[PDB]
């Protein structure tokens, strides 16, 4: 299916033009016939990309409607209708009791559906972004005359004409071209224009000059070519299909949740049935022992937990938006924190995508310019008289211009008209010498020889600003070897000087070093023309050297590179300390790749590739032991020949990896290779060639500004400001919230216990029901909510960037250590706190605890309206019931009181509340508002019928207090243990 597309393309640039027409039943000069064009259309189909098998709107919502607790809640609703059915038939009990009870349960899911239909949304417009890149019309030749047609109507065989400005309508074989340059960033991620000529130039179809690709745009010139491939069959058409049609898959956080639902179900059904067999041994039929099993659902199923995890996810995402970091998926909030390996594209991701001047060589000295955006580095030189002579050539022997109307925007960001290298020089001088226009005015250009292909140099002649001269200056630049082949003298610190073979080598040194930095190098020289041979109105000839072009004063060297973004090197450093592996994956050339690798720290000082060793040692590479090399740099052309197992080993065996000159399918393979190992991988990229990789990563991050629309569609996150340092932040957030989610699970689950125990002891002890269905929902969908949510604003209990990535297989979000803590221990102290308030209310109304055993049958007997208490008094049905519901109400309140404690202790997993403090204002807000809700439900008139919640005497409020404080102490005690003895016991039994 998609495996064929992972293989690289196979072609026919090697064929002659004639052979090609031969193969496509086409004429080179006339083109196809209108008849044969139409025929060949219905044959192959449209010049159009075929959209992917989308997943409908209905099924997107309905798959969430069984999101674990969902289904289980239907079982309740449906079985609470087993109540309203047997009731409203045989024993018509007129009420909304079990009807409205059953109802809530189900519609708890429907409205909740929008929270997991918020967690698992998908912005999948890859193919539509690709489709945008096919022009609406094409210029073909049919029957020897040219006409524009719907680009879909283009077929293999016919003659297409493209010119500067337009888009390559299909894959073409260049048969004719005039000064044609093209933009192949869609394939390489590199934007510098590439020539198209009819002569084949490399055995590699993606490298040869006689093939022009769909999804690229003719940048200048004119060309004609024969359509070799249409629609889905084009190089990038295949990339679209590959990128569009990949299987997204489950995120870590999603898998952590699914795994938690299993543990949850696992105990819901162990106890659920365990209190069918125990109820049976006590004298209950398959009408009573069955109703209890299904009974013990709610109590075990956290109805509020979905909503919490979601608002938590959502609330975290909102913060990251506030840091210029857009998240398209809720699940993507976490993945950055579970990430073991990052596969980063180079150009426009790690780097600025902007040929910047990096180094200069003059005064027999290497200099280094500041290459950063906001120019955070320092000043290199201004004193030298040489510097200015150089500066002068850089500004004058230069034809680039800043596009109209940008004084607002900073230099290095403003768009320039001109080739990369000339823009670099322009931006350099404008920056550290004021207006270049200023110079070009003070020194009018009179004639120039524009950079030839053959000359390999560009010169100009200028009227000198200097009034005391106003004579003629010659300025030239080009290939550093060629500029030296035309020099006699050297402007050293102001004064010329013979070009002694001594300097002819200090230059040759500089040239080879800068060249090794992976930087592009230019030579610079000038000549103060002899006024004698050149009058004030002397004529010059740019056609035939009417003037000297030999024996000139060499002034300096300038070297430029597409430099790293400012915070990238550091961002890389931070990830590596977080124990994250950073792999460069670039379509760019290896020299350049490797140089940046070193520059941003992907390759660290001292590390070596086999080739480095062999060169140092002056031995063959066959004789170097591969394991001595920790770094590698793999060309795509080599990667192509390797089996997946061979990639796996390269992956296993190296710490500092650079895959260069990789195709889009190759970036995908690497990722797949990485995942095959088990890792969670973040792809960071910005081009249409990163699409398959971004779309395969566990999390794809795209660049906001420079990012192509395709990268943006394929990603899960957008860095809106192109700030790579955001990546570090993202991982830190994903780590923080993973933790703080545990805390919220712990907090929520704990109150499960005090909600379950009452119904059990109700059956086991034959006592009146201490807490009711309605009461529990007020805890779960009411009072525990803001507390639970508020745990997401918890901080780190340590430097979490300092720790390794979690092992996703071993380090679960919900482990046994959390269940034993929420259930076995804390929730247990919570149940007693509740049961106490129970015994208090009854005992104070005349029912001492001893007499409570065995009573429920009299108590719930509706026909007895004279139940005798412990003191001898007699109680009607409603009377005693009002007392019980008051118990329901104070039990409810007991939980809140002890959820106070659980909140403060779930605030930390290791630290003392005395170390972490109480700066979380959202949490504190939780306590107040939670208590305010409970007081409301208690004291608000009407809530004694709408919810069977009764008013509590002030004394009732303090029953649980000793139990709330014991929780605080118990846990504060226990973590004090944890810290003291890191190694063993309390930690391995109870540490989350």
């Amino acid at each position: 299916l998609d495996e064929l597309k992972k293989e690289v393309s196979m072609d026919d640039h090697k064929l002659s033009l004639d052979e090609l027409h031969n193969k496509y039943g086409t004429d080179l000069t006339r083109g196809l016939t209108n008849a044969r064009a139409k025929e060949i259309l219905a044959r192959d189909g449209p010049n159009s990309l075929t959209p992917p098998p989308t997943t409908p709107e209905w099924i997107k919502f309905c798959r969430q409607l069984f999101g674990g607790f969902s289904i289980l809640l239907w079982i309740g609703a449906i079985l609470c209708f087993l109540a309203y059915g047997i009731q409203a038939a045989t024993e018509d009990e007129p009420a909304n009791d079990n009807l409205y009870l059953g109802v809530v349960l189900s519609t708890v899911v429907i409205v909740t559906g929008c929270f997991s239909y918020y967690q698992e949304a998908k912005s999948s417009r890859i193919m539509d972004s690709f489709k945008n890149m096919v022009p609406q019309q094409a210029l073909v030749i049919r029957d020897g005359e040219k006409s524009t047609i719907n680009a879909e109507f283009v077929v293999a065989g016919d003659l297409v004409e493209v010119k500067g400005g337009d888009r390559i309508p299909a894959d073409l074989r260049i048969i004719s071209a005039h000064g044609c340059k093209v933009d192949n960033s869609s394939l390489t991620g590199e934007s510098e224009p590439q020539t198209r000529s009819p002569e084949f130039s490399s055995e590699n179809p993606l490298e040869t000059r006689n093939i022009a690709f769909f999804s690229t745009n003719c940048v200048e010139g004119t060309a004609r070519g024969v359509v070799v491939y249409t629609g889905d069959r084009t190089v990038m058409g295949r990339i679209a299909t590959l990128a569009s049609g990949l299987e997204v898959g489950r995120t870590p956080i999603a898998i952590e949740i699914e795994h938690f639902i299993h543990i949850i179900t696992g105990v819901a059904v162990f106890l659920g049935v365990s209190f069918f067999i125990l109820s049976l041994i006590l004298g209950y039929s398959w009408l009573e022992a069955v109703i209890f099993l299904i009974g013990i659902i709610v109590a075990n199923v956290p109805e509020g937990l979905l909503a919490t995890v979601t608002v938590c996810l959502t609330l975290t995402a909102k913060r990251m938006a506030r840091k210029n970091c857009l998240v398209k998926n809720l699940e993507a909030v976490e993945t950055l924190g579970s990430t073991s390996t990052i596969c980063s594209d180079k150009t426009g991701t790690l780097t600025q995508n902007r040929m910047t001047v990096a180094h200069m060589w003059f005064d027999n000295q290497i200099h280094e310019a500041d290459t950063t955006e906001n120019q955070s580095g320092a000043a290199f030189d201004k004193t030298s008289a040489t510097w200015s002579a150089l500066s002068r050539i850089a500004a004058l022997c230069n034809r680039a211009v800043f596009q109209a109307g940008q004084d607002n925007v900073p230099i290095l960001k403003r768009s320039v008209a001109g080739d990369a290298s000339e823009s670099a020089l322009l931006k350099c001088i404008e920056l550290c010498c004021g207006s270049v226009q200023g110079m070009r005015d003070r020194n009018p250009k009179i004639v120039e020889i524009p950079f030839n292909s053959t000359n390999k140099y560009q010169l100009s002649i200028h009227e000198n600003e200097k009034s005391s001269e106003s004579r003629y200056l010659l300025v030239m630049k080009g290939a550093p070897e060629r500029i030296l082949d035309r020099c006699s003298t050297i402007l050293l610190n102001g004064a010329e000087e013979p070009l002694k073979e001594d300097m002819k080598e200090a230059f040759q040194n500089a040239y080879l070093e800068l060249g090794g930095l992976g930087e592009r190098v230019l030579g610079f020289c000038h000549f103060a023309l002899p006024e004698d041979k050149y009058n004030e109105g002397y004529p010059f000839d740019a056609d035939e050297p009417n003037f000297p072009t030999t024996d000139l004063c060499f002034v300096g060297l300038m070297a430029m590179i597409d430099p790293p973004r400012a915070a990238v090197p550091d961002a890389v450093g931070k990830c590596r300390s977080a124990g994250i592996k950073v792999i460069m994956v670039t379509g760019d050339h290896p020299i350049t790749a490797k140089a940046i690798a070193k520059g941003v720290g992907i390759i660290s000082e001292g590390n070596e590739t086999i080739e480095d060793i062999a060169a140092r040692l002056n031995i063959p590479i066959g004789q170097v032991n591969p394991r001595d090399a920790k770094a590698c740099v793999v060309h795509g052309s080599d990667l192509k020949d390797l089996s997946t197992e061979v990639l796996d080993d390269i992956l296993h065996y190296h710490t500092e990896i650079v895959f260069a000159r990789t195709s889009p399918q190759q970036k995908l393979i690497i990722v797949e290779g990485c995942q095959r190992q088990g890792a969670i991988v973040a792809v960071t990229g910005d081009g249409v060639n990163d699409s398959p990789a971004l779309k395969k990563a566990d999390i794809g991050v795209a660049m906001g500004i420079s990012g192509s629309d395709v990268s943006k569609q394929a990603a899960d996150m957008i860095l809106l400001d192109d700030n790579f340092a955001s990546i570090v932040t993202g991982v830190e957030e994903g780590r923080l919230i993973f933790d703080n989610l545990k805390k919220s699970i712990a907090y929520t689950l704990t109150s499960n216990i005090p909600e379950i125990t009452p119904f059990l002891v109700f059956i086991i002890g034959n006592v009146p029901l201490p807490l009711g269905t309605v009461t529990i929902l007020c805890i779960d969908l009411g009072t525990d909510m803001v507390p639970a949510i508020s745990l997401a604003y918890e901080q780190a209990e340590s430097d979490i960037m300092k720790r390794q990535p979690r092992n996703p297989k071993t380090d679960k979000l919900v482990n046994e250590r959390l269940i034993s803590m929420a259930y076995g221990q804390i929730g247990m102290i919570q149940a007693l706190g509740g049961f106490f308030s129970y015994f208090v209310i009854l005992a104070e109304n005349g029912f001492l605890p001893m007499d409570l055993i065995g009573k429920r049958v009299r108590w719930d007997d509706r026909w007895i309206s004279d139940v005798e208490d412990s003191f001898g008094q007699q109680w009607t049905y409603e009377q005693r019931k009002i007392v019980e519901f008051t118990c329901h109400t104070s039990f409810f309140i007991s939980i809140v009181v002890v959820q106070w404690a659980d909140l403060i202790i779930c605030k930390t997993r290791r630290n003392s509340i005395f170390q972490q403090g109480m700066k979380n204002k959202i949490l504190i807000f939780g306590l107040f508002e939670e208590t305010a809700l409970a007081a409301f439900l208690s004291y608000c008139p009407g809530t004694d019928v709408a919810l069977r919640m009764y008013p509590l005497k002030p004394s009732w409020w303090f029953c649980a207090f000793p139990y709330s404080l014991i929780i605080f102490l118990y846990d504060e005690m226990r973590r004090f243990i944890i810290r003291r003895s890191p190694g063993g016991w309390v930690e391995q039994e109870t540490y989350y």
Binding site: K921, I922, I924, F925, L927, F928, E929, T931, A932, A935, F936, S938, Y939, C940, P941, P951, L952, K953, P954
Partner: protein, 38 residues
């Protein structure tokens, strides 16, 4: 004496009053703390 009828009364009305008042205050206070910065 035979007129002990307070022994079967409780001012639930005033309780319900003071309960709601307190609830409203706690409610407000919570805001004041949350909105310490927004």
């Amino acid at each position: 004496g035979p007129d002990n009828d307070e022994r079967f009364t409780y001012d639930y009305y005033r309780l319900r009053v003071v309960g709601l008042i307190v609830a409203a205050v706690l409610c407000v206070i919570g805001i004041i703390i949350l909105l310490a910065g927004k």
